[PDB]
Design an enzyme around this catalytic site. Structure first.
Site, PDB file in Angstrom:
ATOM      1  N   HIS A  53       0.809  -1.207   0.000  1.00  0.00           N
ATOM      2  CA  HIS A  53       0.000   0.000   0.000  1.00  0.00           C
ATOM      3  C   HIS A  53       0.846   1.262   0.000  1.00  0.00           C
ATOM      4  CE1 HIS A  53      -0.057  -0.091   4.637  1.00  0.00           C
ATOM      5  NE2 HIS A  53       0.305   1.146   4.347  1.00  0.00           N
ATOM      6  N   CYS A  55       4.314   2.144   8.927  1.00  0.00           N
ATOM      7  CA  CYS A  55       4.176   0.924   8.155  1.00  0.00           C
ATOM      8  C   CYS A  55       5.531   0.557   7.579  1.00  0.00           C
ATOM      9  CB  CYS A  55       3.126   1.069   7.075  1.00  0.00           C
ATOM     10  SG  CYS A  55       1.440   1.076   7.754  1.00  0.00           S
ATOM     11  N   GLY A 107       2.964   6.522   9.180  1.00  0.00           N
ATOM     12  CA  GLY A 107       4.314   6.489   8.704  1.00  0.00           C
ATOM     13  C   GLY A 107       5.127   5.329   9.240  1.00  0.00           C
TER      14      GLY A 107
HETATM   15  C1  LIG Z   1       1.007   2.754   8.137  1.00  0.00           C
HETATM   16  C2  LIG Z   1       0.332   2.826   6.747  1.00  0.00           C
HETATM   17  C3  LIG Z   1      -0.464   4.057   6.202  1.00  0.00           C
HETATM   18  C4  LIG Z   1      -0.550   4.230   4.791  1.00  0.00           C
HETATM   19  C5  LIG Z   1      -1.253   5.293   4.167  1.00  0.00           C
HETATM   20  C6  LIG Z   1      -1.341   5.486   2.674  1.00  0.00           C
HETATM   21  C7  LIG Z   1      -2.759   5.805   2.194  1.00  0.00           C
HETATM   22  C8  LIG Z   1      -0.858   4.290   1.863  1.00  0.00           C
HETATM   23  C9  LIG Z   1      -1.893   6.190   4.991  1.00  0.00           C
HETATM   24  C10 LIG Z   1      -1.843   6.043   6.357  1.00  0.00           C
HETATM   25  C11 LIG Z   1      -1.147   5.002   6.989  1.00  0.00           C
HETATM   26  S1  LIG Z   1      -1.303   5.165   8.709  1.00  0.00           S
HETATM   27  C12 LIG Z   1      -0.670   3.955   9.743  1.00  0.00           C
HETATM   28  C13 LIG Z   1      -1.246   4.051  11.012  1.00  0.00           C
HETATM   29  C14 LIG Z   1      -0.876   3.171  12.016  1.00  0.00           C
HETATM   30  F1  LIG Z   1      -1.421   3.261  13.221  1.00  0.00           F
HETATM   31  C15 LIG Z   1       0.062   2.202  11.765  1.00  0.00           C
HETATM   32  C16 LIG Z   1       0.625   2.117  10.508  1.00  0.00           C
HETATM   33  C17 LIG Z   1       0.283   2.980   9.451  1.00  0.00           C
END
Ligand SMILES: *[C@H]1Cc2cc(C(C)C)ccc2Sc2cc(F)ccc21
Ligand SMILES: *[C@H]1Cc2cc(C(C)C)ccc2Sc2cc(F)ccc21
Lengths: 306, 306
Positions: free
Chosen positions: B41, B145, B143
């Site tokens: 993603h 991920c 951020g």
């Molecule tokens: C990580 C992944 C993430 C990806 C995107 C994009 C639209 C690809 C937006 C927001 C996130 S937010 C996130 C929140 C968490 F609590 C843990 C990992 C992520």
């Protein structure tokens, strides 16, 4: 979201850990530039620790009696000196992995990460606090002495603790990197008892803020209090007195959440008087006091290190 | 002595963390040999996540759309492919800091360390467990991920988790390093609810053994039980059923302490039926279930890593 007891990344410190052996005794040392720092009781046998005269014991030691090994590679010792309760072993090679660093002496209530090591090798990393009685509650087996505690700000490691002793009650005592013990403790195997393990009030309040931020809010109440009224309850429960300085430090968390510091004190007061009634806060069934306000802000903001 | 929630030293993994940006989206990747692994993603906008067709979205992406940065230095992407829910970005330079490693898919109840990262930079390290409902209870902001979970045996890092999603209830879901989610979760922003968060019984028993070893013994009682009788209580309290395999795994801790596994079950049964009456065990006021038997043995023995 989520809030965890979180240690600093340990790689910068891993690169500084070495083994130090003097005669029968092996523990850990910290190699920064061309100096290895370690507990002076590396020179003692178990017998010696009952009543050591460190200056006399050291007379019998020469540079070549201090065997210093960094992984598989031996370091050459070209000088040694005792500073308070640490030895400084000058070696002929600067550690190529030396990070930017500082030595800091922390105040009770401040937190730091410990890299527990044996035989110069890292075993694990965890977060501690300097307790108000100047002990720490760590996990240290025989051979862990010389393991260090530290904080990181971006690129710079601030070393604040070196491990030296386990008290008979199972808590831990050690020094700053200048070799001065925290609290009244000495590097002798004697009757040393710790004083009252009081709770770090400002840290509990910070953690309640972390809870509110991360979704846990059942403990918020309709009440407020004053510093003096709250401290009447703090004393009863062996909590540190809350000061105006503490309130000021909580200002930013107050602003993010919109919960006045004194309102959160009234929540904490109710929790102390009534307990948690079998509920939990951030996965804990007691009031956690080893997160500082700065810890909460950092973890809730995603600050990283170079 | 002392027993702490202890993460593996993180340096070997720090050296593998990079930033990956695709268009508007930045997260973390894992650089091993000449491949960077990251969540697929990365190719999505926030809008896309409601209903993404990953194969269609990927058609519009070329190697040069994946910006990969290792500290201050840009990596050249020479190929890309999707495997399940991860992207594999082939780069023209092998990571010089690649450790010995394996990819492992863990079972529920197993523990691991997480190196939380943002923009390719480490922020902190903590210990997690794969819950029986295939979530983890982490600390992950936007951020994070692509941050990974891992175990170390001596010199070899076994990567077992990559972070992908936060559920609306604040718990966390992700994949193994082959890109297969743990549990039923998908990389879509939908209604995905977690099942029952059952307690990992064998881990609680291991932790009670750790307590006894490290001095906490008030909960030992005069009683014993049977597997079937204990499990009648386990079910009531949403604990996993205890199996003969679990008893066998606790054998070594049973031998060190001289407390038969079924006697410790009778202690646990009493704690479940009566609570802790305001007492604590290893500094916790609830029954801790994110230490495995192997975790307890390791920490109580001082095992180290190359
Ligand atoms: C990580 C992944 C993430 C990806 C995107 C994009 C639209 C690809 C937006 C927001 C996130 S937010 C996130 C929140 C968490 F609590 C843990 C990992 C992520
Ligand atoms: C570390 C220090 C230590 C030194 C010696 C020698 C006699 C110098 C013997 C035993 C120890 S044991 C120890 C135990 C702990 F719980 C924590 C640190 C040490």
């Amino acid at each position: 979201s989520g809030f965890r007891k979180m240690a600093f990344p340990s790689g910068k410190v891993e690169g500084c850990m070495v083994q130090v052996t003097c005669g029968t005794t092996t523990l850990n040392g910290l190699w920064l530039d061309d100096v290895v720092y370690c507990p002076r009781h590396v020179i003692c046998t178990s017998e010696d620790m009952l009543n050591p005269n460190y200056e006399d014991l050291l007379i019998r030691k020469s540079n070549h009696n201090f065997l210093v090994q960094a992984g598989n590679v031996q370091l050459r010792v070209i000088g040694h000196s005792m500073q308070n309760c640490v030895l400084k072993l000058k070696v002929d090679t600067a550690n190529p992995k030396t990070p930017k660093y500082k030595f800091v002496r922390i105040q009770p209530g401040q937190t730091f990460s410990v890299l527990a090591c044996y035989n110069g090798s890292p075993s694990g990393v965890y977060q501690c606090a300097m307790r108000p009685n100047f002990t720490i509650k760590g996990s240290f087996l025989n051979g862990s002495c010389g393991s260090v505690g530290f904080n990181i700000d971006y690129d710079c490691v601030s070393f604040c603790y070196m491990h030296h002793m386990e008290l008979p009650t199972g808590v831990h005592a050690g020094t700053d990197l200048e070799g001065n013990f925290y609290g009244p403790f000495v590097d002798r195997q004697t009757a040393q008892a710790a004083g009252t393990d009081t709770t770090i009030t400002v840290n509990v309040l910070a953690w309640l803020y972390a809870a509110v931020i991360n979704g846990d809010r059942w403990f918020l109440n309709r009440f407020t209090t004053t510093l003096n009224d709250f401290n009447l309850v703090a004393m009863k429960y062996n909590y540190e007195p809350l000061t105006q300085d503490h309130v000021d430090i909580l200002g930013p968390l107050s602003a993010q959440t919109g919960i006045a510091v004194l309102d959160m004190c009234a929540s904490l007061k109710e929790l102390l008087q009534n307990g948690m009634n079998g509920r939990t806060i951030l996965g804990s069934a007691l009031l956690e006091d080893e997160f500082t306000p700065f810890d909460v802000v950092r973890q809730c903001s995603g600050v990283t290190f170079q």
